[PDB]
Amino acid sequence: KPSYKVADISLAEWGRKAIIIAENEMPGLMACRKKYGPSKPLKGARITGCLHMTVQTAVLIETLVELGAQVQWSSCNIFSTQDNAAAAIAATGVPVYAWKGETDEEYMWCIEQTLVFPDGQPLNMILDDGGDLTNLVHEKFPQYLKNIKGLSEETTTGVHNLYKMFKEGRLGVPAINVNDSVTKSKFDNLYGCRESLIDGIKRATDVMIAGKVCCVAGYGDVGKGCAQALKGFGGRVIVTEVDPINALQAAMEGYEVTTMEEASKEASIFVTTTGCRDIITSVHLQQMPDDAIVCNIGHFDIEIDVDWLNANAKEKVNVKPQVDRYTMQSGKHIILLAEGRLVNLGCAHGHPSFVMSNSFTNQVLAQIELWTKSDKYAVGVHVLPKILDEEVASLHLEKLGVKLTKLTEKQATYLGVSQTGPFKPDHYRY
Amino acid sequence: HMSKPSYKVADISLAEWGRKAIIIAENEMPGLMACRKKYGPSKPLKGARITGCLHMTVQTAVLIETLVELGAQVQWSSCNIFSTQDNAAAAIAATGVPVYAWKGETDEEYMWCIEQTLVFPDGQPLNMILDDGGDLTNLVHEKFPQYLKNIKGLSEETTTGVHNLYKMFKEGRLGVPAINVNDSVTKSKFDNLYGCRESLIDGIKRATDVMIAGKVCCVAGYGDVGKGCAQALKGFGGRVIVTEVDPINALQAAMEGYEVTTMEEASKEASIFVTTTGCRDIITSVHLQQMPDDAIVCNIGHFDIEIDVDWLNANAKEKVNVKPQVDRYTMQSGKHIILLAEGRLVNLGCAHGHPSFVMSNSFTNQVLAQIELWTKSDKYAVGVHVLPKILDEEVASLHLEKLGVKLTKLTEKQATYLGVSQTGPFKPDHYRY
Amino acid sequence: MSKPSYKVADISLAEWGRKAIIIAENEMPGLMACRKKYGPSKPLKGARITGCLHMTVQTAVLIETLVELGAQVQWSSCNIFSTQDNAAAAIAATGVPVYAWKGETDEEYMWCIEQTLVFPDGQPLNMILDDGGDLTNLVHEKFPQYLKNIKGLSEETTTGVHNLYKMFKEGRLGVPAINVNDSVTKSKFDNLYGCRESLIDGIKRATDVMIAGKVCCVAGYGDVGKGCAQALKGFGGRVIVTEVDPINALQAAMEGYEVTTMEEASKEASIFVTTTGCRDIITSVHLQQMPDDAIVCNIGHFDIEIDVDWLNANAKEKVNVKPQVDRYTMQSGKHIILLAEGRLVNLGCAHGHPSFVMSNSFTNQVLAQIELWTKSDKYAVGVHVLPKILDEEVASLHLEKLGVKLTKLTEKQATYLGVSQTGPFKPDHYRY
Amino acid sequence: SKPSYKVADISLAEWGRKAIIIAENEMPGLMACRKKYGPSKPLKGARITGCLHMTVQTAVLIETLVELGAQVQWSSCNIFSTQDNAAAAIAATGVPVYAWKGETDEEYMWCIEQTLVFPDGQPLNMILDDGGDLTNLVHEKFPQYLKNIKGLSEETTTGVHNLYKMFKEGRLGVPAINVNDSVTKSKFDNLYGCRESLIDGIKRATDVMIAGKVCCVAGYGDVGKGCAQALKGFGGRVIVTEVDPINALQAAMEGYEVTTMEEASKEASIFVTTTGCRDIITSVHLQQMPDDAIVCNIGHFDIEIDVDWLNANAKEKVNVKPQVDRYTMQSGKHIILLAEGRLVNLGCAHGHPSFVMSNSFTNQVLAQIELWTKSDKYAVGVHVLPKILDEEVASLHLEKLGVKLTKLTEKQATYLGVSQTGPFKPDHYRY
Ligand SMILES: NC(=O)c1ccc[n+]([C@@H]2O[C@H](COP(=O)([O-])OP(=O)(O)OC[C@H]3O[C@@H](n4cnc5c(N)ncnc54)[C@H](O)[C@@H]3O)[C@@H](O)[C@H]2O)c1
Ligand SMILES: NC(=O)c1ccc[n+]([C@@H]2O[C@H](COP(=O)([O-])OP(=O)(O)OC[C@H]3O[C@@H](n4cnc5c(N)ncnc54)[C@H](O)[C@@H]3O)[C@@H](O)[C@H]2O)c1
Ligand SMILES: NC(=O)c1ccc[n+]([C@@H]2O[C@H](COP(=O)([O-])OP(=O)(O)OC[C@H]3O[C@@H](n4cnc5c(N)ncnc54)[C@H](O)[C@@H]3O)[C@@H](O)[C@H]2O)c1
Ligand SMILES: NC(=O)c1ccc[n+]([C@@H]2O[C@H](COP(=O)([O-])OP(=O)(O)OC[C@H]3O[C@@H](n4cnc5c(N)ncnc54)[C@H](O)[C@@H]3O)[C@@H](O)[C@H]2O)c1
Ligand SMILES: Nc1ncnc2c1ncn2[C@@H]1O[C@H](CO)[C@@H](O)[C@H]1O
Ligand SMILES: Nc1ncnc2c1ncn2[C@@H]1O[C@H](CO)[C@@H](O)[C@H]1O
Ligand SMILES: Nc1ncnc2c1ncn2[C@@H]1O[C@H](CO)[C@@H](O)[C@H]1O
């Protein structure tokens, strides 16, 4: 029924204006529009999408439509949506069903609306962050896997699901994984969360990082950026890790590596980045000092046990939205952010638009590659080619005023690499 | 009897939220809390009526209530139209403290708010002055010199203000003893530095959400605020260019990986601009005309002298308010200029200012100076004074426990060798830290 | 007029090298655990391993670790300025054949490699450990008959592996080969953190120049250039970066570095660092524009990234300040300081990467030799990387020296993340 | 002064000269002093005795003073600091140089004693000092010269603490300029210079990896700030010790853990003393230190570490290289001491780079002129150079670094209450 649901459509004015600022911050999406605009390759493809309903997503949705595609959209998180960007998109008649403060019930209903298209035909393509949509079409009625071509996935959690969905019958549709692109994982994960995380803590807490002991759980791409942020603001950062390689990395970069049992006692600020269950537990929380802040920057709220805390705290006081302060039976206080969910999105606006142009430009491509080259893409995981990975990166250099050297003909022969690309072997880790 | 507002605040309903945020802040401000335990039972500020014109913040509420717990009547205003946090103002007003402050203030209103704080509820005029920027101080001097005979003290908090103070004593135009809280090492080298390190990107990000990395930034000035401002942008991946008029500060910046060029050159390259000089005319028409599209322009030095906002408003094809304190000028060239806080302090205008922990250092010096000027007035003089180093070292000592520092005690052998006391003072007075 | 057994410069330095070897052992936890683990079972028994690696204090622990695993080892350096003379004498004094000294000639360099090929039992080498591909090349070009009995080669550097892949695309690879460089425990540690410290050390020992305030150009933002640029930035330099790859170029901009061309950097920069592995990075055009007394150094393997021959051909005067530190007076009258004749400045002007990071690279190397000697089979003719199970063991072996307390996944968590509690913890496409 | 000069190997002079030539291009302030004051020869008639590390940088200072009319004689202030090639270059030039690396304490004192009376049999009229050793020799011994000495300049925080203490005790006999506490020395040489020189000396001595290691810096002043930043940037985790709450808060706001030596001596493998105070590392701490810990001192004097106990109570002492000693403790653990506890940058490397030393030595030359020319502007007592001179020192180095400084308009300058040529800051500005 509802053409759209977006909280307050009066915010559309504000949103169009953050959109136009984002377009200036998202030159890769803009270069897609000039390069692929004339040819409109996504024509007659109706794509349901489940991603944070941010202004940067509006630029992606709108780049998709300018590339000739019908688009439905719904947020991958309850607090991920920015309500200004919601109304602005829906004021253009692109059906969007999403708002901040969703209920788990409201969250999954919106996805049901996106599977439908206003014309009526089921769908042809799918773009997802996490697996909720991907899983729903599978686990909740698969009648429309055949008509559609393929799917696109962003998060490293949801990519893990798709790799393991291909251990058996799952993946009735061919899939590209846009996370394992370097222009995504080595930028969004690391460079983005470097900006987004501290932003979210400040807005919720306005706490001083300088001189505070900080614990980062996980020293992967997200963990490396989160620790760099706090180290750069005068924080001393202890790092927890289960992988030997990442541990040596943190240690060779000046970070003490030890267990949460040790770190829960010393540190005052806690950020979970592992993508694994039960990073902060009961024993840990009771050991933390008074008014310690505990947040999670990984997909899914299973890294901290909010359930135990909600249950074993004496009092739960809501300071402001997504900021809850618990008074433990001990008398120490625990401040929780975003109920342990995606803090950058819950207590701020996520990664800036520029790094999202690298992410969503890969996604534009992934979507073109599946529909125009369905012959090339058997059902399974796929990963985009490298000259395409390099092309996303090359599209942001002009904005950054980067003057890139071109290899001499004699030079390229020496390196076995074409002058135009690709420049690195497949195994290259960057 | 024309009756007088007991307070003027945006929404008194916000009192409950402010109390909550205050309580969180108190626990991250040990120095103010320590001041309450040591001097509070002895009411050192009894009989003193302090008038305060400082950005009305959560942190400033802990300062107000600390002075009140130390036996002082307090009335407050903000030194900026955009600096006041409304939730803290409501809470302090809900404590029977006359406060006249709200975000979104007009210049006429701002002046009205300060004048309401001069006379306390019994008709008696103010004894004491706590000021940031000089506006209240100048007001009493200029318009109300009748009050200065019975004003025992003046304390000032910021660099632009201490400069006005000094040349007021130089011109003979200062008539009350004064203390320079900004040049206590615990504020100068922590607040102006470590606070702006964190407060500047908070203001920028909240208004714009802009990625610092890969971007050319300009920091006009490499003083305490500029040193903090450049370190933050460079730690976020920014390429920072600094301008400087003192050769020493330019050499400091050069030796720390920064290019030092003129603002004429930087307007070409930089997309982000922060002004921190306390000086006028740092960004001019020529500078803004050179700037790239959607360049973000902000000012962290006290007062809107550094950028020519008056030119911008008057010479733009179009001006659009994205949201409060964020305006985007569509210039004659077709380029766009994103201005933050209308050329006013971006950290308090587009965010909540410096963190509570570092503000405890500054406000602890403030409480202490107020005790000095009230309880030991005959010691002081009309001039411009600085707290003793034994007191500056105390400020720091109060904050070490919260961070977990374990300071080492000098032996009697070590003390005599260095010629100091095991208790201090530990450094010479010309020591720059 | 007879095979020398060993040729080093000053066998007197043995005691000094042996005392420095004891310190390095205590800084190389992986190699020592290799001796303790693999020593008793002697898996390199029968192997006649020829190695062409910089004859350093760190390489001596590698040689003696291979001998403790049963191997017969003979050695030459892969660069004429890299050999540390105390290390070379010590190893020679134990009786292991080593032909390496600082101050070698190109003709003496080849002589040294040729002396490592046939062992004192009169038998040619059955295993190769190369750094640069030169020993690999020589054996394929000049001595192809020896390839039937070479059960495998292991290569430590990015440039040698590029030679190996091109060899195998063509029909030119004679043996099975392992690529130690692109083990995560090498590239992301040795090339990054190693060059972070060794590049500055080299310039400092050679020049004693200040990094604070200087404009610096690093050509390349690979693993070497990332760490080189990080080092200079940490001492107060502003580092201009040149790049041909869009991905590295974006990475450098996100780390606050200006990315431009050498054409422009040659004007502003006073310190020049080349890290690409490609010829002709610094040309006559670039050297003529440089500021007076600019320092030019190359941390790439091979001296092709700068035109030293042009500097020699077209300059008014060359003065030698000290060994490996040469000042050219150009026709302009401006001065150009060249370190180590364009050869690896860390190895040439200092001692190279520190021992601890070399334990991670050399422990991969010890592992690869075992693989090729002991499991020839799973290793056909081609270029192979070590398995992640063992990549992780390299890092695991170094965590206690650094005090790191690692975390054990609960069986619940491991089943959630789909991993063994003992690894491998990541997919092979992980870029770390 | 019978020997005229005593240097280790005069045969190394040509090498030193080639190295001093490269140093001159990195030292514009001293060169500009030769340009400006060259013709006037303002220090003409000046017999200057110097007691600073005999380095290539000290040599550019020596010859700059000579360009300015002065006759100078030089000794080193540390037994291991002298660079022998530079002493040889200056010795061959005729300026009497009495310094060699690895002196003995007895030889060290005899070296300084030759510098007092110049070759014509006349005593010195000017003192230039680093550590106060020469200053105290002239006061405590040979005190008859103090009346024909117009002044002294001191480089070192230690030197000036002693100089300030001398004035309290009434013992200071000459007007003394405290060169150390000029901003262009303290905030650049002690900081930026020790950041590069400390890591150099450890590396040349040990070749140890800084990454992954735990390190402890005792003190967080100008030296300890730079020493700690240096190690943290190469991947090390730095623990800081402090007796002053202000410096300790600073170190904490920068992410460093501040704790006692008793705790850090157990975790960290690298130890550098930066306080200028006695008894920083003791037997208690040394026994708890991890096996093969590297312990060094960057303070002017070798009092922050107890080498006497290490020698007396260790099982073995093995010399790896000059100024590198590995002690085997009764525990079996090993401790590596650098340069026998003395200054490790100058002992195991070549000290601060030349560019930062130009800032320091340009202050020194200006101070010597002021005391020799404007002798009446100065009464006995410890003084500092004017801010207009300090600002100048800095201004003379901006061109080399490419710095394009902003020039204030008259409206701006009157608004700030400042001249367009300075001084631009209140004298209490800490920068
Ligand atoms: N908020 C965002 O915008 C954003 C961006 C990127 C990724 N993510 C999410 O964050 C999560 C991690 O992302 P990633 O890119 O860093 O993947 P990653 O594999 O590279 O990092 C996770 C690391 O945590 C470690 N780990 C696993 N269980 C652990 C434990 N109990 N303690 C410590 N470490 C443990 C692993 O060893 C692993 O290296 C993913 O779920 C991803 O979806 C969020
Ligand atoms: N918003 C905040 O949180 C906050 C905090 C502290 C101070 N301040 C204010 O910021 C301003 C300056 O702070 P500060 O402590 O660093 O003062 P400062 O004296 O230490 O630094 C100012 C520097 O700017 C330079 N300068 C002056 N005019 C210049 C010009 N035209 N171009 C370039 N440089 C110029 C000076 O050389 C000086 O070194 C003051 O107005 C102060 O009141 C704001
Ligand atoms: N000094 C040492 O101890 C040491 C250690 C490891 C590797 N190396 C050697 O240094 C070189 C690089 O090693 P690596 O790991 O970083 O390889 P890499 O591939 O990761 O880095 C090379 C980079 O240089 C860039 N490049 C290539 N041609 C260029 C050009 N004309 N201008 C600018 N950039 C150009 C490439 O884009 C590439 O990103 C190799 O020769 C390697 O064998 C030396
Ligand atoms: N090697 C060099 O080239 C070089 C360069 C500059 C200075 N120095 C010398 O290094 C020493 C320090 O120089 P500075 O400028 O930094 O002086 P400083 O006063 O600024 O720093 C000394 C710090 O150590 C602290 N301290 C004092 N006693 C202590 C103790 N027992 N434990 C811990 N901290 C203690 C003090 O609080 C002080 O902050 C002096 O001897 C100075 O002469 C050497
Ligand atoms: N949160 C805050 N509350 C009150 N004053 C602040 C805050 N942050 C910064 N300031 C002060 O505001 C002044 C700038 O006008 C500075 O002196 C600074 O110390
Ligand atoms: N100190 C060292 N000793 C031995 N080999 C080294 C050292 N430092 C670097 N290397 C090696 O030399 C190679 C250069 O070809 C590097 O890739 C690295 O493996
Ligand atoms: N390389 C050097 N040459 C000469 N003096 C130096 C050098 N490095 C440091 N110094 C000086 O030595 C003093 C320490 O005793 C410092 O004040 C510093 O100025």
Locate the domains of chain D by residue range: 6-186+351-394, 191-299+303-341
* Spatial contact of C2 and C78, defined as CB atoms under 8 Å apart: no
Q: Same topology for domains A9-180+350-394 and A190-341, yes or no? A: yes
**DSSP state string for D46-111:** -EEEEES---HHHHHHHHHHHHTT-EEEEE-SSTTT--HHHHHHHHHHTS-EEE-TT--HHHHHHH
**What is the Cα–Cα distance from D294 to D210, expressed in whole angstroms?**
11
- Distance (Å) of CA C341 to CA C305, D101, D135: 11, 30, 47
Count other Cβ atoms within 10 Å, centred on residue D125: 21
The CATH number of the domain covering residues in A190-341: 3.40.50.720
Inspect the interface and report whether the beta carbons of C402 and A251 lie closer than 8 Å: yes
- As its CATH architecture, domain D191-299+303-341 has 3-Layer(aba) Sandwich (3.40)
**What is the Cα–Cα distance from C383 to C392, expressed in whole angstroms?**
20
In the DSSP assignment, the letter for residue C104 is -
**In degrees rounded to 5, what are phi and psi of residue B52?**
-120, 125
**Tokens 């490499």 map to which residue?**
B222
Most B CBs within 10 A among A16, A199, A206, A318, hence the mutation to make, goes to A206
* Spatial contact of C60 and C91, defined as CB atoms under 8 Å apart: yes
**According to the annotation, is D148 in a ligand binding site?**
no
Give ligand 2 pocket residues (Cβ under 6 A): B 158-160, 192, 196, 199, 220-221, 223-226, 243-246, 249, 276-279, 282, 300-302, 345, 347, 354; D 406, 408, 412, 424
Q: Which strands, in side-by-side order, build the sheet including C382-384?
A: C98-99, C72-76, C48-52, C127-130, C152-155, C176-179, C382-384
Q: Check residue B168 and give left, alpha or beta (phi > 0: left; psi -120 to 50: alpha).
A: alpha
Tell me the structure's resolution in angstroms, rounded to a single decimal.
Answer: 2.5
For residue D6, the cross-strand partners are D98
Q: Which strands, in side-by-side order, build the sheet including A323-328?
A: A256-257, A236-240, A213-217, A269-272, A292-296, A333-337, A323-328, A313-320
Q: What type of residue sits at position D146?
A: L
Which positions in chain B touch A399 (Cβ < 8 Å)? 214
- Distance (Å) of CA A316 to CA A285, A311, A324, B304, D387: 15, 10, 7, 43, 58
Q: At D316, which helix (H) or strand (E)?
A: strand D316-321
**What is the Cα–Cα distance from B332 to B321, expressed in whole angstroms?**
18
**What is the Cα–Cα distance from B402 to B423, expressed in whole angstroms?**
20
Inspect the interface and report whether the beta carbons of D267 and C236 lie closer than 8 Å: no
* Spatial contact of D289 and D333, defined as CB atoms under 8 Å apart: yes
B226 Cα: distance to centroid of ligand 2 (angstroms)? 7
Give ligand 7 pocket residues (Cβ under 6 A): D 52-53, 55, 57-58, 130-131, 155-156, 189, 300, 346, 350-352, 357, 360
| Residues composing chain B | 433
Q: Residue with the nearest Cα to atom 2 of ligand 7?
A: D351
Which positions in chain A touch B325 (Cβ < 8 Å)? none
- As its CATH architecture, domain C209-300+304-342 has 3-Layer(aba) Sandwich (3.40)
Count other Cβ atoms within 10 Å, centred on residue A106: 15
Q: Tell me the three-class secondary structure of C55-76, residue by residue.
A: CCHHHHHHHHHHHHCCCEEEEE
Closest-CA residue to B202 (of A229, A202, A212)? A202
In the DSSP assignment, the letter for residue A423 is -
**What is the Cα–Cα distance from B185 to B426, expressed in whole angstroms?**
13
Is the Cα torsion angle A212, A218, A219, A222 positive or negative in sign?
A: negative
* Spatial contact of D237 and D266, defined as CB atoms under 8 Å apart: no
Alpha carbon D112 to chain centroid distance?
Answer: 17
Residues 6+ positions from C134 with CB-CB distance below 8 Å: C52, C78, C113
Structure determined by: X-ray
**Tokens 């714009």 map to which residue?**
B208
**What is the Cα–Cα distance from A330 to A318, expressed in whole angstroms?**
19
**According to the annotation, is B132 in a ligand binding site?**
yes
**What is the Cα–Cα distance from A171 to A166, expressed in whole angstroms?**
6
Give ligand 5 pocket residues (Cβ under 6 A): B 54-55, 57, 59-60, 132-133, 157-158, 191, 195, 302, 345, 348, 353-354, 359, 362
User: Cis ω on the peptide bond leading into residue A95 (within 30° of 0)?
Assistant: no
| Residues composing chain A | 430
The CA-CA-CA angle for residues A400, A404, A409, to 5°, reads 165
C155 Cα: distance to centroid of ligand 6 (angstroms)? 11
Residues 6+ positions from D390 with CB-CB distance below 8 Å: B248, D182, D183, D184, D363
For residue B273, the cross-strand partners are B218, B297
**What is the Cα–Cα distance from A33 to A67, expressed in whole angstroms?**
7
* Spatial contact of C220 and C274, defined as CB atoms under 8 Å apart: yes
The CATH number of the domain covering residues in B12-183+353-396: 3.40.50.1480
Closest-CA residue to B212 (of B190, B237, B191, B193)? B237
**What is the Cα–Cα distance from B327 to B340, expressed in whole angstroms?**
7
Closest-CA residue to C345 (of C238, C232, C251, C258)? C232
**What is the Cα–Cα distance from C393 to C397, expressed in whole angstroms?**
6
* Spatial contact of B4 and B116, defined as CB atoms under 8 Å apart: yes
Q: Is A292 exposed, middle or buried (0-12, 13-18, 19+ CB in 10 A)?
A: buried
A192 Cα: distance to centroid of ligand 1 (angstroms)? 14
Residues 6+ positions from B282 with CB-CB distance below 8 Å: B220, B221, B243, B263, B275, B306, B307
Given 3.40.50.1480, 3.10.20.30, 3.40.630.30, 3.40.50.460, which CATH number is that of D6-186+351-394? 3.40.50.1480
- Distance (Å) of CA D135 to CA B215, C27, D275: 53, 45, 22
**What is the Cα–Cα distance from A415 to D224, expressed in whole angstroms?**
46
Q: At D240, which helix (H) or strand (E)?
A: strand D237-241
D218 Cα: distance to centroid of ligand 4 (angstroms)? 9
* Spatial contact of B358 and A209, defined as CB atoms under 8 Å apart: no
In the DSSP assignment, the letter for residue A185 is I
- Distance (Å) of CA D410 to CA B221, D326, D343: 18, 63, 48
Helix intervals (H) in B117-154: 135-142
Choose the residue to mutate in D55, D156, D352 for probing ligand 7, maximizing ligand atoms within 8 Å of C-beta.
Answer: D352
* CATH T-level topology, domain A9-180+350-394: Rossmann fold (3.40.50)
- As its CATH architecture, domain C11-186+352-395 has 3-Layer(aba) Sandwich (3.40)
Q: Check residue A245 and give left, alpha or beta (phi > 0: left; psi -120 to 50: alpha).
A: alpha
Which positions in chain A touch D238 (Cβ < 8 Å)? 254
Residues 6+ positions from B289 with CB-CB distance below 8 Å: B267, B331, B333
**What is the Cα–Cα distance from C92 to C86, expressed in whole angstroms?**
10
Class of domain B193-344: alpha beta
Crossing angle of helices A353-372 and A55-66, in 10° steps, is: 30
Closest-CA residue to C178 (of C365, C390, C393)? C365
**In degrees rounded to 5, what are phi and psi of residue A405?**
-70, 140
Q: In the numeric block, which tokens belong to residue B44?
A: 């050192």
Q: In the numeric block, which tokens belong to residue D57?
A: 């940088």
* Spatial contact of C308 and C284, defined as CB atoms under 8 Å apart: no
CB pairs under 8 A between A and C: 162
Q: What type of residue sits at position B132?
A: D
Q: In the numeric block, which tokens belong to residue D333?
A: 């653990």
Spell out where B236-383 has E strands.
Answer: 239-243, 259-260, 272-275, 295-299, 318-323, 326-330, 336-340
Q: In the numeric block, which tokens belong to residue B33?
A: 């809390």
Q: Check residue D45 and give left, alpha or beta (phi > 0: left; psi -120 to 50: alpha).
A: left
**In degrees rounded to 5, what are phi and psi of residue A97?**
-125, 90
Closest-CA residue to D305 (of D338, D352, D328)? D338
For residue A317, the cross-strand partners are A325
